[model samples]
Target: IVDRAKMEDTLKRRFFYDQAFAIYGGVSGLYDFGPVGCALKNNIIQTWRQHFIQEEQILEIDCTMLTPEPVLKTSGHVDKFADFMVKDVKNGECFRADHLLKAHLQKLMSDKKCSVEKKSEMESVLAQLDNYGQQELADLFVNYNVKSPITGNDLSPPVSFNLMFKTFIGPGGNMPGYLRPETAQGIFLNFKRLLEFNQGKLPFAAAQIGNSFRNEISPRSGLIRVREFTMAEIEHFVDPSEKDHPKFQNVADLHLYLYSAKAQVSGQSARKMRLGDAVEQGVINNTVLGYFIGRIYLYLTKVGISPDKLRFRQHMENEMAHYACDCWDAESKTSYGWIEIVGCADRSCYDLSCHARATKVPLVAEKPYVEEVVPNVIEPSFGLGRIMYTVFEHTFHVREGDEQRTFFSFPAVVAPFKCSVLPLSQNQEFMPFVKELSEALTRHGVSHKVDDSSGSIGRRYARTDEIGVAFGVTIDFDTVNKTPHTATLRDRDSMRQIRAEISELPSIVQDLANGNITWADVEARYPLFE
Candidate 1:
């Protein structure tokens, strides 16, 4: 188990991230990423781009974050994109109705005097909390005697609160606009152009990565509930008549933990099922959706999400998006329990059809003999901040014997700096070798930090590990005394070192970080050092 408090202290001390405007006492639901945090975030996004966009040949786009009011109105966000909120009658403080109810029920469950039957009933309600309607949520509040957590005051009846961050477009403050709630809408708005670019073909995918905003009544759990976050969304336009994918067979054999709606309603755990069998039995909506689920699984796992702790949970009928026919969330198990990191929804011609109807534009494809074809959409939207948070929680580790020694075992693909250059001392003799090795790694396009700080070698290693530097090259006295100028290469996780020629390190670290070579391969080629 990770010592979360200690890890957080290390993060803050190392300038990983902190509350936004922290010098001014900070703001709720906002944070500022420091040097290490920014590097780690950018690395993750680069990996995301390589994994999805480059490999899939998907068209990538960047849309303006400011969206017009009509754009949201046509998509039903203006009227429907809201969470149930209840205000404290005495203090005027607001809280999400479902969240408040969940807190109440959980507290009740913790009561030693509570009966098993009552606990079971509360558990059932908690399972379906997100599915409850506004009125249903309000009813729960009254029945459970839920009140303000802070003030213990009577709560107002639940009301729908819009989550958009509103803004006026111009200096006149006449045109209403909002920061986009999600990146998918931009893809839908550009559907016509994307289709034209694809030679009017079905099965074309357009992807966008950008910042999105939400006005949460209460944002908690660090990055998990931030008001502003970066998201990556893909809209795969497919023909309704043929929703099959050519690459479906590639991932057919993979097994995944699937939490279907039926299982949730029946209070059963998620089942491990084969991707192919689930699609064949229609447990998953379509092969395309299943394929993307599998792809998402691979991406998440590759980026250090624990495979055993990840599951795809199907959304309940009442909780699903109004426009989606089917939806599944790729949820990662973190310290906060299961949290959604990505949403894959099969929206059956809703977005395009609605936009076209509102604008009088024919956002339709034509075939020789068929009627008008409005393409269906398979959307996989990723919450990057949530994923990053999960990665941190899941990969955190402490040394077996020492609680003071802790580090994040981030994979090379997403570590802030792939390699760390540590000199045994600030000795004049070691400086030349450090320069040589640093230049070698740099020539191979590797990111690294030179740490010749005033400390023991072990302390330097610990410092490098704390920031999740994948591997370290240590220049010691042995290199200066040796004939061929060999240095020790250390793996961050195992704390194992291998002796290799300094000249050969450029390609060695490059191949290891790029996944072209395994650690075992390196060990086999070079002699392992204690």
Candidate 2:
């Protein structure tokens, strides 16, 4: 069984991250990353940059977090960005109405008092939770006798609760602004400049990696639900007349486990199919969308997310966002249930049209021989914090009957440190060898640390492994005394060691750190060390 508490303890103990403002009794949903945590997060972003920005040739931007009121108002956040909240009559506590309804209905379905037919009916309604309106939710309260889970008090009628964090822009609070609810709007607002930047191209993308804010009624579940978080968003603009991708054929044969809208409503499991098949069968709307779905799969797995726990779930008609024509979430299964880590949607010019009309700025592009057109958007938005949390949980490992043995098996590409150099002992001979190797690796641009502490070798290895040091190098008497100096290179997952030449160490270890080579290849080339 996966122990979430144990994982939390590991994260805190290793200084991966901790609750922000903990000394002041703490606030829910805020967190701070320590040294290891920051390194890990930065490395992950670096990998993401390589995959999306560099590979896809996307235009990257850094937009301001403080968004003007008119911007959000025009994008529909002023009127439509809200959650259904119902307050407790007695204690005045607030609860998301949909959450309460789902919890209570689930309990009712499991109760002996509920008939088989009633359970089926409740299950059907629960599956369509997103389709229900405020009135339907209120009716559910009456039908199921929903009450406050905390105080057990009577609940008031549900109402819309705006989630944007409001602020003032200038002195005397004249200009109103809000912390952006998402990063996509920033790209949309700058569509004209980006189109010109792309030289009036129809098929181009703009991406932003930055922080976004959402004021939740009650924040819980660690990073799974947070008020302040980082998001990576891409707005891929393509011609409306041509939704096909030039590179779709490259990923056409890639398999995806898709939980389609029909399967969800019918209460069925996800089906495994190739991307080409899904697009041809009209399960996925277009080739561009399918290509992005396949790209998301490759990126997630490359960052250490388990393929079995990862799936793409299509959004039911009512579940999609107001600006989206069609959407799908890349969900990862954890102890907290399957949560959406990334969302890929076909925005279909809704954003460009809305902002253009509101500001009266014509956001359009035209080719000499082609007609003027409003480009459609294919957006892939990622919640960085949620992905990090899921990665922490999935890569966490423990040995059976060996509580002392625990580590995070992060892929070398995203591990906090690519390699850790340790002296077999604190003796003078080992120190020189350790320093030399550490400096050599550093010069080669490999991230590593030299450990000359008095702790046992096993304990040092465990310490480094806990925070995801992919490779560990030990310099001992053999390196200083032996001809053509050699050291032992240790693999974190297998705990396997191989003796390698000190001169060849920098290149081989750097290759491993960059994910250009695998452990299997290393093992096949070098003899195993005892």
Candidate 3:
């Protein structure tokens, strides 16, 4: 069984991340990533870059985090980017109306005192909660006698709470500005320039990985509902008439667990299908969307997300964005239930059209056959911190036996440190070998640390394993005094030992870290170190 609290405690105790501004008693919805956490995050982002930006040659761009009011107003963030929030009538406490209603409904359903008919009603209401309007959500308070979770007091009617973090553009609040609610707007704002950069190409994507902010009414669930977080967004612009990817066929045969829109309305479970069949049957609106849906599965699993726990859920009509024609969320099952880490949507030229119309600018593409066509956008938006949180939860494990072992088995590509070099005690004999090996590892582009701490070899390896170090290089008495200058390579996942020549260590470790070689390959090549 997974213990989320235990895993979270380990993360904080091990210095992965903690609440930000801890000295001042900290704040909710904000966190600061420590050294290992930052390294892990960087590695994950690097792998993401390799998978999306490098593999697809998507044009990468960095946009400003601060946004002028006009940009958001044009993009619909000024008015429509909001969540329904209700307040305590007495204490003036705020709560997300939908979340509060859902929780109460869930509690009723789980309570033995509640009648079966009442529980069924609650379940039905919860099923279509996202489809409800603010008025309907407010009506839930009267209908179900919903009250504040904290005080059980009467609640105010639900109202729209715009999530943008407002700010001033210049000194003295002279101009109205706000932090970007999402990165897609920035990319859409630059559509004309990106088109020009692509030499007036029709089907090209621009990706941005950066911070976005949302002023949550009540932020909870650690990284899941953060006020500020990192996002990786790709805006793939294609001619509205041509919403197909050239490489769609490449991913056609790929299978995915799809909880499609039709299934959701009918209250059916997710069904597995080939990507090609999904697009052909119009289950997923278009080929480009299907291509990305498949690619997201590959990338998430590549970084160690469990395939069985991951599924693509199609957004119901009321759940999708106003601008989105169709949306599918790549949701990973965590201790926090199925949380959406990635959203792939067919935006259908809504962003570009909105910006162009608002600014009175021409953001269109032209080909030989057509006069001009406004490009549609197929967007894949990733919440980096949420995905990282899911990775931590899914990869976390507690091995039980003679000695209990708690560790996060992150994939080598995303592990904070690829490996750690540890000398068996503070012995002088092992120092030279450790130093030489560390130098060689560093020179060969392996991320590693040399821990010469005075402790048992198992203890030292345990310390590294806690922070998700993939491999452990132990420089013992044998490495220095033995004939072949061989050292033991310990696998973090299997905790198996193998002996290899010191000269072969650098290349072998690099290969292992890059996932070019596996432990079996290393074991077959080298002798087992008992």
Candidate 4:
């Protein structure tokens, strides 16, 4: 929704994606990320590792994206995780039934032809579309005027369309494997290994960031719903008898925007209140849940999302996952509207308990002096694709000028290209200077690029700026003959240009990246171009 046409045009123009199997006509619902997109995603993952794993001393692991038949059956994915679909009797085009019904209801309500009372009834039905059972869904379809997308005829009863691609292994097609629907199951499968790694600690956590797959009945929007995507998940283990977060005291007083079931039940607005107050007032389920919600706020803010654009939406009873004790989503406002980017759920011991029963592994914790069964878990599951989209919407900027340029003002830690080194020209005589400058940047462990292609100085700068490169250093003709070595530095955000001696280039760029020196500091220290 963040300018889909613009995003697509930029992506294609920048070589972010090529026609998949160009020999054959390309198919929808599939994409390939080129160099820039891949690098940007990797940098984001690296930043996540620095912040979540290294800084917080959290344990991280990589898990496979395939699962055995029994594992998914035990996890209940074989039963649910589906979309409602209907096929046209004549044209045979399939449509997601729920979306069709919702659209139909919207049109009826908006049309002047429908009565007010009829509109109210349709509105009530639309609100319950997600929670309806097969029977209730059929009843609505019988009365509603919703028709098939392909043929002008009454549609068949909605059928559940399971959204996981199932495949068989081996040549004979005997062994079966499924594309993993979620990353949470991998953490559960490795509970024993994690518990062992933690030195048998009771409240240890295991986090994983990896790709997960889900087949969609129909895909829409840019990157919002995709068949394959990345997720950052954490499964925090605690003692069931003592279900409380040790660090809960730190953020107990901070106000959170909460859309709890209680508020939704009465058709009222979400309440804003302190975490501790909510828990004490029986609104939040527990301190463990509250603690992680507080940590989510910290993480989002750390990544540069404005606090006003973020909110915590408690899941309504029918909306909550079947085994979840309590659930909440950290929703962020974007051009697409409020979308869930992170899910914080008190999953209780359901996951470990299921794996334990299925595999006969000791999934429970046995701490010293512990007597009874321990049912403890608080999970913070993130949708990495959604997070990336949120970052794009939040940090994207349009400069104020006659020839304005669109750029991503991403924080230094997450920028795809840290810096760019440009030779003022591809002059045959200045080869040595450009070569040495590029080598020096490479040796310093900075991700830098040099573009001597057929373009003007401004155009090259603009290209680098679009990729969110922080600094652009130009090796000019003056550097080859000057008394002392010097280079021009261009800032991406302010478009400010400054000249400094070649000896100071590295440190100046380093400080700029570190935020130790600002563009204002650079201009104050040296003469700036008009």
Compared with the true structure, all predictions reach lDDT values of 0.88, 0.87, 0.87, 0.76
> Number of the top candidate by TM-score?
1
TM-score of each: 0.96, 0.95, 0.96, 0.87
- Colliding pairs, model 4: none
- TM-score of candidate 1 relative to the true fold: 0.96
Q: Write the per-residue lDDT of candidate 3 for residues 1-530, one digit (tens) a residue.
A: 47988888889998899999999998889999998899999988998999999999999899999998988888787888999988888988999987989888888888889898888767777778788987788778788888999868888888999999988877787689999989988888788788898899789999999999999889988889999999999999988778788888888998889998778778778998899988878888778888899899999998889888999988878787877877899999988688899999887878888888888987788987558887888889999898999899889988665576688989888999888888765667777787788889988899888886667898878778788889988877788888889888999988898998887798899999887898899989889987
Task: Give the range where candidate 2 is weakest over 10 consecutive residues by summed lDDT.
Answer: 397-406
Question: Candidate 4 lDDT, tens digit per residue, 272-357?
Answer: 78888988987887788888888788777666566778889887666767568679899998875677889999878887777788
Candidate 2: residue pairs that collide: none
A best-first ranking of the candidates according to their TM-score comes to 1, 3, 2, 4
Can you tell me which runs of candidate 2 are displaced by over 4 Å? Answer: 108-120, 368-370
Return the number of clashes found in candidate 2: 0
Clashes found in each candidate (C-alpha, N, C closer than 3 A): 0, 0, 0, 0
lDDT of 1 by residue, 1-530 (tens): 45668777888888888899988998889988999999989988998898899989999999999999999999989988888889887877888886889888989999999999999989999999888998888889889989888858999999999999999998877799999998888888888888998888788999999999998888867788899999999999998988898998999999899999999998999899999999977889789898899999999998889988999999998888877888999999877778899999998899998899999987988655566698989999999898988888888888775546878989998899899888777767988888888888999999988886777887888888888889998778889888888988999999999999888987999999999999989999999988
The predictions' CA RMSDs to the true structure, in order, are 1.6, 2.0, 1.8, 3.3
Error of 2 at 298 (Å): 1.0
